[PDB]
Amino acid sequence: ESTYWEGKAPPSVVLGPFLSKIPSGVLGPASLVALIVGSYCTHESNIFNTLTVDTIYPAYVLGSFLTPISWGLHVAAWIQKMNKA
Amino acid sequence: KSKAVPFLPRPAALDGSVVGDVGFDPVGFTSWLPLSYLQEAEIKHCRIAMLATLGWIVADFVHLPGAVHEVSSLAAHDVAVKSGALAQILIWTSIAEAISVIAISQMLEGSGRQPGDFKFDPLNFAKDEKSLKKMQLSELKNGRLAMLAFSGIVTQAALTGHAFPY
Amino acid sequence: FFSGNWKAYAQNPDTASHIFGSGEGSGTAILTFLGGFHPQTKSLWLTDMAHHHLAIAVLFIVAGHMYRTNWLI
Amino acid sequence: AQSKALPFLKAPAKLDGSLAGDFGFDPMGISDQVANLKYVRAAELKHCRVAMLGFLGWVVQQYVHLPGEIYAESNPLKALTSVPLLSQIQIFLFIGAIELATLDQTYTADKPWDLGFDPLNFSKGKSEQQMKDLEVKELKNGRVAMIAIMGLIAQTLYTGVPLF
Ligand code: CLA
Numbered sequence: 489e490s491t492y493w494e495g496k497a498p499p500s501v502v503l504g505p506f507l508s509k510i511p512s513g514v515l516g517p518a519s520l521v522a523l524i525v526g527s528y529c530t531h532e533s534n535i536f537n538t539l540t541v542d543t544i545y546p547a548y549v550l551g552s553f554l555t556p557i558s559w560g561l562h563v564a565a566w567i568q569k570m571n572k573a
Numbered sequence: 574k575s576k577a578v579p580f581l582p583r584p585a586a587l588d589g590s591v592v593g594d595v596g597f598d599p600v601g602f603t604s605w606l607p608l609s610y611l612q613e614a615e616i617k618h619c620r621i622a623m624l625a626t627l628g629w630i631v632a633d634f635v636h637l638p639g640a641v642h643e644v645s646s647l648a649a650h651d652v653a654v655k656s657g658a659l660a661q662i663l664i665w666t667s668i669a670e671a672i673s674v675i676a677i678s679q680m681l682e683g684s685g686r687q688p689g690d691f692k693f694d695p696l697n698f699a700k701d702e703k704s705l706k707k708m709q710l711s712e713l714k715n716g717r718l719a720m721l722a723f724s725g726i727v728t729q730a731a732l733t734g735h736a737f738p739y
Numbered sequence: 740f741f742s743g744n745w746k747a748y749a750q751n752p753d754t755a756s757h758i759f760g761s762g763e764g765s766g767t768a769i770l771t772f773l774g775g776f777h778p779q780t781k782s783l784w785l786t787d788m789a790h791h792h793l794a795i796a797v798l799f800i801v802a803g804h805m806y807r808t809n810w811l812i
Numbered sequence: 813a814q815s816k817a818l819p820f821l822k823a824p825a826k827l828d829g830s831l832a833g834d835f836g837f838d839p840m841g842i843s844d845q846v847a848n849l850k851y852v853r854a855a856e857l858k859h860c861r862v863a864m865l866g867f868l869g870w871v872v873q874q875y876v877h878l879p880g881e882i883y884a885e886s887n888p889l890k891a892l893t894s895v896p897l898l899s900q901i902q903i904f905l906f907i908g909a910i911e912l913a914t915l916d917q918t919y920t921a922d923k924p925w926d927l928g929f930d931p932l933n934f935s936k937g938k939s940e941q942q943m944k945d946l947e948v949k950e951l952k953n954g955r956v957a958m959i960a961i962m963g964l965i966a967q968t969l970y971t972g973v974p975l976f
């Protein structure tokens with residue numbers, strides 16, 4: 489326990505007992521891939537092609553949800569990297 | 574060090590389990606999740622895939638106690654969700670799975686429930702530990718084979734239209 | 740809803756000549772994006788507000804699973 | 813493990829031994845919040861008795877009716893509206909008169925379900941094992957009736973066929 493921290497990086501326990509054991513070399517590239525996929529899904533559902541009732545595409549929607557997620561994945565990747573993991 | 578993959582080292586979380594531990598985890602998923610949760614998921618997939626493979630094969634051969642059951646297990650899904658059978662099976666499956674959350678949560682927390690154990694042996698096919706371990710290994714091997722077989726069955730029966738050979 | 744063809748609930752919304760409380764110029768849709776106001780009542784579309792509350796319901800039900808309880812997550 | 817109904821789960825702490833009908837069935841752990849099992853058992857037994865009476869009334873109204881015309885409706889849910897409000901208000905007042913004294917009784921007593929109702933003295937002379945067996949019979953039958961009366965209501969609301 490003791491999620492409180494004062495050093496350079498928080499302890500790996502703040503990532504939960506599922507991300508605490510992911511190597512940073514896995515989280516990092518996974519975070520970048522998720523960010524790219526989410527940005528592309530957002531730019532394909534909108535921006536590049538205007539949205540319409542007949543075109544919603546749960547893949548692009550679910551995808552776009554990987555952009556907010558990506559943020560968390562690379563934050564966890566940095567936390568793991570600084571904690572020698 | 575691994576028994577399944579001689580090149581890669583043995584997984585750290587896989588030492589011995591009567592579930593068929595041959596040390597096959599190249600991506601190290603056992604480090605991610607607790608081994609017990611992954612074992613429960615694997616056994617659930619095994620049982621679902623075995624039931625599904627048997628049902629697909631049988632329902633294409635002899636399944637017509639009525640009119641709406643005159644389908645080829647490929648258009649069966651839509652026809653029988655329109656009929657209402659899949660709704661009932663989903664209701665009972667949801668009840669069983671909602672109970673299974675507590676079963677999965679009672680393990681991973683304490684208790685003594687082994688992964689995939691529901692104390693369902695009404696006919697007592699397994700008697701002692703040796704039979705239990707042997708048939709656990711047999712069930713998991715059959716379930717993995719059934720997973721791959723059902724994957725092949727659906728992919729082939731969607732890549733073409735045919736019967737049992739697919 | 741079960742088939743996933745959720746666009747069907749938005750097809751054929753209330754027209755611009757719909758008299759509120761009457762079937763003249765009405766539609767069959769129940770969840771739509773229209774924006775703005777009803778041309779007659781000068782108020783938000785009822786189908787707009789139903790869709791709004793459905794979205795809010797889904798979001799809040801999802802957000803209500805955040806904190807830990809007796810099931811380890 | 814300790815649940816008989818769900819042989820795999822361990823029952824909660826308050827499900828043990830006494831309070832007949834205890835099969836360890838509390839997966840959601842509702843018993844963990846109640847201070848005791850007295851009130852929940854009282855509510856369960858009241859539901860069991862009301863559901864038994866409801867199922868019996870459902871079947872009898874399906875087959876047997878009072879001589880008057882106002883009681884000639886076969887569908888129980890339609891008879892809920894066809895029957896004059898006088899009969900229903902009399903039934904409700906009778907139930908409330910029975911319910912107020914038991915309202916004083918239930919929230920404080922050790923056996924709130926024990927209303928002292930035994931006009932035929934079916935329990936006088938029975939041993940403890942026989943009494944517990946009778947309690948188990950009552951609870952079983954009541955749970956089955958509850959399921960059955962809810963099913964009857966659902967099938968009447970969904971198909972209009974009050975029976976079968
Ligand atoms: C009014 C309904 C009602 C109530 C108040 C109780 C109350 C009780 N039951 Mg019980 N039971 C009921 C109905 C009910 N039961 C039915 C219908 C069955 C048959 C399946 C059972 C089978 C049963 C067993 C086998 C056992 C109990 C036990 C218990 C006791 C401990 C559990 C507890 O605290 O839960 C309190 C329960 C509630 C507060 C009810 C909450 C309402 C939930 C949310 C139900 C939601 C609806 C449901 C999912 C579906 C209903 C629709 C339809 C399909 C029927 C407690 C006195 C245990 C015992 O004896 O301990 C002493 C025990 O082992 N019950």
Ligand SMILES: C/C(C=C=C1C(C)(C)C[C@H](O)C[C@@]1(C)O)=C/C=C/C(C)=C/C=C/C=C(C)/C=C/C=C(/C=C/[C@@]12O[C@]1(C)C[C@@H](O)CC2(C)C)CO
Pocket residue numbers: 617620621624638639640641662666667669670
């Ligand atoms: C009356 C009727 C139909 C009809 C008729 C007539 C009157 C007869 C004749 C007329 O001519 C026509 C007609 C229509 O009227 C009968 C219908 C058939 C029934 C009643 C059979 C039901 C099938 C059961 C299935 C298909 C269940 C599948 C099992 C699953 C289990 C899932 C699990 O994942 C769970 C949840 C936990 C995991 O741990 C492991 C397992 C257990 C694998 C789903 O994966």
Ligand SMILES: CC(/C=C/C=C(C)/C=C/[C@@]12O[C@]1(C)C[C@@H](O)CC2(C)C)=C\C=C\C=C(C)\C=C\C=C(C)\C=C\[C@@]12O[C@]1(C)C[C@@H](O)CC2(C)C
Pocket residue numbers: 864865867868929930931932933934952953954956957959960961963964967974975976
């Ligand atoms: C009534 C009953 C018991 C009544 C007992 C009473 C009043 C006893 C009272 C007394 O002992 C006391 C209290 C104290 C004693 O000193 C005095 C007396 C007076 C002697 C049990 C019913 C118990 C009733 C039960 C268990 C009913 C189960 C019903 C089922 C399964 C029905 C299923 C279906 O209805 C569906 C679901 C759908 C339909 O379409 C198809 C079918 C199949 C018909």
